[PDB]
């Protein structure tokens, strides 16, 4: 059926595997040049933020075995050398962060991948946010695709609802974001992101993200109407979007919440959720949604100028969307 | 000369004492119903975020002795019972957070305080931000005063510059704020701020603040043009203001930075500072400024819609302003 | 059958309720003077370290409703005024930390509690560690009992195995322990534990515990042979015991691990667990065991002098034991 | 006079530079293949744990300029290619962690370094702890030397005092240690230290250290009498030694503290310090001592079996000793 190969067994690769297991999608191979099979077992079995894997994990004859599913493993430094074609022609999830362009990722294709999903923004690959524009995917012309960013996946669904109901004249986004693997435990080297080299654990760290502007790629009507930035703070997971926007049509705060509520119950079900509870970040650790609107946290200056709040599990929600995109793409073959 | 009595030996009271020592202002008494003199020594001598006191601290004959300065100590539960009049008639810094109204704080006056500064917003007491409106202080009519909040003290100076140069049509503020003493180490009781009861250390915690709106009290032209909210995050000190505003007159980002730069060098010197360095929060721990503009962290969508970033040491900067206000008030007797 | 009333809805009270639900023990009432029913719902529904409650929680007609179980709620400041006798005569779990002595806790009895388990060490109430000395419980004479401390519950089972196999001549314990509700977010007041007032999140904090010595109360042969202390560190949950002991009979490290392994598989199953994996603290969050021996972390200088390591979820493991003690006590009526 | 070149501008290299400035030792060059001069300025100027550099730092003409001292900079990947001989023949501090053996470090020598101090334990280079065995240094035969580890530098001075006064029959050490640059922000790859790959900020992490055993290299009478291990915890700096030892001669706890006190006031002044205050870890951030004995934190089971506690700033204290070792070595030329 749908079969999946994963390149890179970092945080995304591992959670993607977990999600595939949960959604019953067959993973046929994992490739990582650095992480051997016995070590894969350990990294998958135990997880500091998401807990122990709820099934069984073992290594056998150079294979990763998860709940009796035997998964091939490779240690190729070059995508070109991965034998995708010898193990069916799976969809490939590209999680290394190193092959973002269509040209770079196309290496997978030449080695036998039927299609490729890049788990990061791409300079040129078509970008998709489930619930927003996946229907623009076209199998006739799109062999390599991007699932955008965790952040864009949180903001876009919310921007869609607000724009379609009220009209976003212009918006500026801040994401208060958990620290990540690219960061440092103590002040260390990060030569093209100096602030990002500073102790992740000790600091609030300003960061530049194209995540808000990129919404204009999945919602063309918003091109040039959004940008923003980030603060990385000392939490290990879960992040929050803080969107300040001016609306075309005037909207009471209650009209806004009612619109979001309706979207969550209906067309954006499973993508955008809604809460009125007095929640905090940990309440969304392990939440599969792309975006959870926080009604009570937001505030309006007036009917045309408002600040909207939405939570996202930047690891798990995004990983869930990657698998959702694979499934959708496959339904379109 | 100017003499100072301090009520409450919590974080603010202790740093205020430290600042008084640093600026050579004589503190004649500290009152706290709970913290005995020997314990005062310990709490003042050692500080997890601001380091050890750089001088000497001892207890002797029921007095706190700091760098040979003998300071009286009291343990009164009721301001009315504090013998201010018997030890000169000092200005009193009210740091308990419990006597915010003019009526409540007036207890100090009836017991002999010449004037009172409330180290928190007040329902009715006149509110002042040094560098913004202290000149509206009037000794003929104002015996009880408020130094506003740490947050308002960061935002107001910046809002002044932006408004006076370009005009703020409307603005929405978010402060990413370090956790505080009102918070909890683990999920515990906070019955009129449920989110604030959740583990401070584990969570990004949305919080409601009137700090942005209160800017309209010190800058009347901005009444009704500002509001905002907060996220409390797992850092012990230093916070950051994130102001999204629409400007009347169009302003390039460089025009904005040049205006702020000029204010810092001139009329707002010692209050508002300016940086273009790749800074993070810890870089401002122990900074005495009310607000440090971060040129490179901010971002503009266009000449009329911008997001501006300013740092503040919510403990030390504010404590410095409290003492500055005392000194100014005294210069006006 | 067995029915349970819980006094105090703090971390222990809440997890005890959770465990009772999990093990099918009927809780008939919760008393807390400060936490109202609607707030109880919130505190139980969401948990920063243990995640959302996996069932349903609502408030109705002054009752807490958990998975359709209607639970009475009270707000009595005095145990004497709690109507235990009016709702059957349940076993009472005393979790406030305020009524530790037999005399203080007996208030529950006079108001109708059939028996009382104090979830903390008691100056005089008989103390029990499941798997070690519960069989010494006697329903004829013991109406008020203590479940000791989390720490003692981790150390005692391990000490039992080591003593019975090899003989502990003497031992010194350090527990590296997560911060707790008694600690402070920032340097604040703690007049009979000065170090414990210091910022929990910023500091390694030495602490005095009678937990190791108290093992001599549940294992009489070890009276006078054990003591120790603690370091509180910036983790929200899960702790670790570090036991340095001299052995009577010489024991290779492999002999030691084999003994612990056998104990875990057999007589101490469900109390003591055993691992040889490369684990860290988060791997034991939500673990119900009293003690998980870490084979590879320990180290021996020689056959008679060794350092042994055992993990414990100081919240959940202990809460499980409280309920286990209730069940055992009931089987003895 | 004494001139110093530093290889590697990581945490140690930077603090060593800071210390050299403070103690008036001339640093003539810094080499780092990755960190360019402009970036060096930034990394030295700002420090998350130790605060901003208290002087001036600039880059000019490929030179690092600190308080008007012009320092050469190089970007050589191979020690052999560093022009030590062209800039006098300085002592070289080897801080990369990559050239630990006499053979590897000798590359510095062949390129003109007069002597080399390795800022880490070495498989074969003579190891020194200031205050313990520096007098065994011999310039006739020792061109390459090691300053041992931060941990060994904390334990050895304390062990010396205890052994010389009472006799250590055997001891087991635990160090509760702050996380370091080798650790990871979130669960990531660490193939020869699996536990050390786990999130540093979320976890208590058991770690194997030869630091206690290595004391037998600087105090020969203790060879085979000491070993231990570590727990890495979520603090950015400052660590603590927890030494459990059996004594030959019986010693009251007061006898022990009196011995340490006398050692600190006399022969080990500037190396070992002594406190009876209710201290916590942050109280020692920026402390230059190798070891600060904590009298009140320790505990004795009896006169021959005791647990002793000593703090160390694992970054700054060690860096100070490196420079002290350089100075001592030079006094011996």
Curated annotation (Swiss-Prot), chains A, B, C, D:
One of its GO terms (molecular function) is NAD binding. GO terms for biological process: flagellated sperm motility; glucose metabolic process; glycolytic process; positive regulation of glycolytic process. Keywords: Cytoplasm, Glycolysis, NAD, Oxidoreductase, Phosphoprotein. GO terms for cellular component: cilium; cytoplasm; motile cilium; sperm fibrous sheath; sperm principal piece. The active site is at residue 150. Disruption phenotype: Mice display greatly reduced ATP levels in sperm, severely impaired sperm motility and are infertile. The record marks 177 as: Activates thiol group during catalysis. It is found in: Cytoplasm. Coiled coil: none annotated. Its EC number is 1.2.1.12. It comes from the Eukaryota. Belongs to the glyceraldehyde-3-phosphate dehydrogenase family. Homotetramer. This is Glyceraldehyde-3-phosphate dehydrogenase, testis-specific. The lineage of its organism: Eukaryota, Metazoa, Chordata, Craniata, Vertebrata. The chain holds residues 107 to 439 of 440 of the full protein.
